[PDB]
Amino acid sequence: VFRAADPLVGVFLWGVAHSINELSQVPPPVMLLPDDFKASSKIKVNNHLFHRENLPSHFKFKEYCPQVFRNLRDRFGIDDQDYLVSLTRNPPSESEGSDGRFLISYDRTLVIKEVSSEDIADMHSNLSNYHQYIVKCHGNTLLPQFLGMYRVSVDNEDSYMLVMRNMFSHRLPVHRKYDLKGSLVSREASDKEKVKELPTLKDMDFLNKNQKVYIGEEEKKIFLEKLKRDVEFLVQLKIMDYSLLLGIHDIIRGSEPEEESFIDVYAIRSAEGAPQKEVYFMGLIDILTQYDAKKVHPEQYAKRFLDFITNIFA
Amino acid sequence: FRADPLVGVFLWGVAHSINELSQVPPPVMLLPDDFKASSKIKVNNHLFHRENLPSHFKFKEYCPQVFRNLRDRFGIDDQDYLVSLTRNPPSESEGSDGRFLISYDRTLVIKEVSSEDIADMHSNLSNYHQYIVKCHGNTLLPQFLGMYRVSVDNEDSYMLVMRNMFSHRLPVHRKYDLKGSEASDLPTLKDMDFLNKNQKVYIGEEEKKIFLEKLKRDVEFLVQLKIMDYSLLLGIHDIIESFIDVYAIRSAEGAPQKEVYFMGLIDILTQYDVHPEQYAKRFLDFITNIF
Numbered sequence: 001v002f003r004a005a006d007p008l009v010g011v012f013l014w015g016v017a018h019s020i021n022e023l024s025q026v027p028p029p030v031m032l033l034p035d036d037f038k039a040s041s042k043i044k045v046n047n048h049l050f051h052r053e054n055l056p057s058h059f060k061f062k063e064y065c066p067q068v069f070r071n072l073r074d075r076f077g078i079d080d081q082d083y084l085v086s087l088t089r090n091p092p093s094e095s096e097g098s099d100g101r102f103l104i105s106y107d108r109t110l111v112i113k114e115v116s117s118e119d120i121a122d123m124h125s126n127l128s129n130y131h132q133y134i135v136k137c138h139g140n141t142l143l144p145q146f147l148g149m150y151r152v153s154v155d156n157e158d159s160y161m162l163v164m165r166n167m168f169s170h171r172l173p174v175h176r177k178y179d180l181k182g183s184l185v186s187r188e189a190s191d192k193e194k195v196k197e198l199p200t201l202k203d204m205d206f207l208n209k210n211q212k213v214y215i216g217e218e219e220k221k222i223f224l225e226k227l228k229r230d231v232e233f234l235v236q237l238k239i240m241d242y243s244l245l246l247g248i249h250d251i252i253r254g255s256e257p258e259e260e261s262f263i264d265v266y267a268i269r270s271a272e273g274a275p276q277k278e279v280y281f282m283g284l285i286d287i288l289t290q291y292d293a294k295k296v297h298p299e300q301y302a303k304r305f306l307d308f309i310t311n312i313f314a
Numbered sequence: 315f316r317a318d319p320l321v322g323v324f325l326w327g328v329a330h331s332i333n334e335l336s337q338v339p340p341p342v343m344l345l346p347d348d349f350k351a352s353s354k355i356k357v358n359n360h361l362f363h364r365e366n367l368p369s370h371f372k373f374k375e376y377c378p379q380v381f382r383n384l385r386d387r388f389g390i391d392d393q394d395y396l397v398s399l400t401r402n403p404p405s406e407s408e409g410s411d412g413r414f415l416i417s418y419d420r421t422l423v424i425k426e427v428s429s430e431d432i433a434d435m436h437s438n439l440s441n442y443h444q445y446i447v448k449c450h451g452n453t454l455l456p457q458f459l460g461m462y463r464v465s466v467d468n469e470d471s472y473m474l475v476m477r478n479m480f481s482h483r484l485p486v487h488r489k490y491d492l493k494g495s496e497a498s499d500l501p502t503l504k505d506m507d508f509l510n511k512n513q514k515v516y517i518g519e520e521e522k523k524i525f526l527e528k529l530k531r532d533v534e535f536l537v538q539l540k541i542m543d544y545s546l547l548l549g550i551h552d553i554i555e556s557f558i559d560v561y562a563i564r565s566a567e568g569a570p571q572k573e574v575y576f577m578g579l580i581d582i583l584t585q586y587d588v589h590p591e592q593y594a595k596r597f598l599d600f601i602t603n604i605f
């Protein structure tokens with residue numbers, strides 16, 4: 001059943017418009033109540049002998065905790081209308097690498113990742129904790145910015161979408177990619193992964209390449225003290241198995257002929273004495289994983305993580 | 315409890331439909347499927363709260379392509395239809411046994427109807443639609459512009475939106491429901507009080523026949539469908555630029571009073587189950603008899 005447009009994205013793009021447009025009529029609550037953290041807005045469409053081109057005739061769309069995620073976007077500095085333009089003005093571009101879908105907004109500021117149903121449950125188990133941490137740090141963090149969480153039902157099949165700020169650059173393309181855990185049971189990018197154009201390298205590949213990150217001592221201090229706070233928050237929640245996403249843009253290799261419009265929140269320029277002029281992009285990914293696993297405590301995972309990351313700097 | 319969700323949902327559904335319909339190109343020709351089609355939407359929010367709309371409702375539009383085409387053939391743009399119903403709440407009328415709302419514009423009417431009138435509309439929607447294209451929309455019959463079903467707190471109410479037959483600016487002072495064969499206590503006069511009050515309409519020779527020729531055409535379209543028990547709604551405004559009252563006929567030159575008459579057929583679609591062509595025969599001669 002080849003289609004030119006994927007109905008899963010079309011229904012998602014429809015539902016984001018509908019969600020935000022109805023949200024424009026609902027005044028923001030003065031304080032989020034514990035009921036807002038179990039709330040949801042669903043809507044089910046049933047057209048009969050009335051066909052549309054972009055959307056299927058039978059679909060559902062649900063938004064998880066609208067008031068919570070609306071408040072989160074605000075605290076992260078994103079106007080709801082800017083969120084809408086960025087996701088819907090033009091179709092997002094598809095990216096490969098992750099399990100299911102992984103979309104990038106047309107302005108390359110937002111990311112939309114397909115997650116599982118247990119991931120949706122893990123977010124609810126800690127949305128209140130995550131929100132209270134965004135309040136406390138005023139949104140200045142290395143954790144991902146969870147901006148919206150949605151369920152898209154099409155052809156009697158539910159997909160779960162999660163929107164976030166893009167940790168990479170809206171305009172500077174990433175030339176080298178790592179995912180760093182600091183672990184012992186060592187991590188190499190597979191042969192299958194390594195022959196791609198942009199392979200996600202891991203701890204051992206980082207070391208094998210003599211990779212170092214040159215940012216200068218003040219930025220190093222701010223980044224490590226931030227990383228330390230964020231990790232302690234996860235440790236308190238008994239979380240482990242998270243990663244630092246590290247991207248590297250080669251400056252002299254440049255972008256395409258495309259050279260103020262947006263701020264790359266997770267970017268740090270290289271130090272003035274660096275051997276290479278580059279831009280780094282760093283963020284924690286795959287948080288929200290509890291220690292309970294059916295065959296390392298969160299405190300030990302963290303200490304090892306922080307010590308590894310501390311030494312990637314030079 | 316009475317501060318109203320039925321109106322609040324209905325107006326939410328109309329904006330939602332006209333927004334959806336702006337993204338579906340209007341067809342040039344209709345299919346038999348379009349006369350059995352429908353668009354249904356169900357909202358269910360959980361610990362989410364909004365002012366106007368309740369937490370749970372349904373909105374169903376009947377044959378969206380047909381009525382959209384009928385609004386086109388009646389000279390109504392969809393956006394002007396949307397502004398008309400929703401930009402300010404419709405004022406209600408206490409013509410009871412169901413709700414009866416008039417747009418802020420006074421250009422359109424929203425009448426609550428039964429589940430069998432919905433069945434009656436579907437049995438003849440195509441017959442009605444093709445009569446409209448042949449007369450190029452120049453009829454005394456009502457202009458059915460849209461038909462929806464709203465569900466709130468597990469009760470289904472059916473809404474039919476028609477063009478307003480009365481004026482959008484000039485109020486009606488006398489109102490008749492003319493049939494042929496008296497009213498118990500603007501009141502709705504029945505037929506005897508036309509006579510008793512020596513009421514007569516003066517509209518001019520040339521315009522009287524154009525109305526009567528179309529009345530014969532319209533009625534002759536109903537009798538071919540075994541329709542009876544229709545009425546001629548006659549509104550009357552003693553004369554003591556934005557829109558048009560297309561059922562208004564101006565004061566005749568040299569009349570006792572210079573006035574404006576609003577006349578068009580209502581409560582059609584009642585099928586025989588006194589004969590249709592007899593019922594015709596009596597009504598037509600009755601209404602032909604005012605000069």
Ligand SMILES: CCCCC(=O)Nc1ccc(-c2ccc3ncn(CCC)c(=O)c3c2)cn1
Binds near residue numbers: 284
């Ligand atoms: C419901 C709980 C979910 C658990 C959970 O924390 N997952 C999680 C968290 C964050 C990300 C993420 C965010 C931004 C990103 N920007 C760029 N790139 C680079 C693209 C090549 C990313 O990969 C990226 C990945 C992915 N997954």
Ligand SMILES: CCCCC(=O)Nc1ccc(-c2ccc3ncn(CCC)c(=O)c3c2)cn1
Binds near residue numbers: 476
């Ligand atoms: C689906 C229903 C089948 C039966 C059926 O044809 N009903 C039916 C048909 C037409 C009307 C109608 C139309 C326009 C009108 N304009 C003004 N005013 C004046 C308001 C004071 C009206 O009353 C009016 C009433 C009412 N009912």
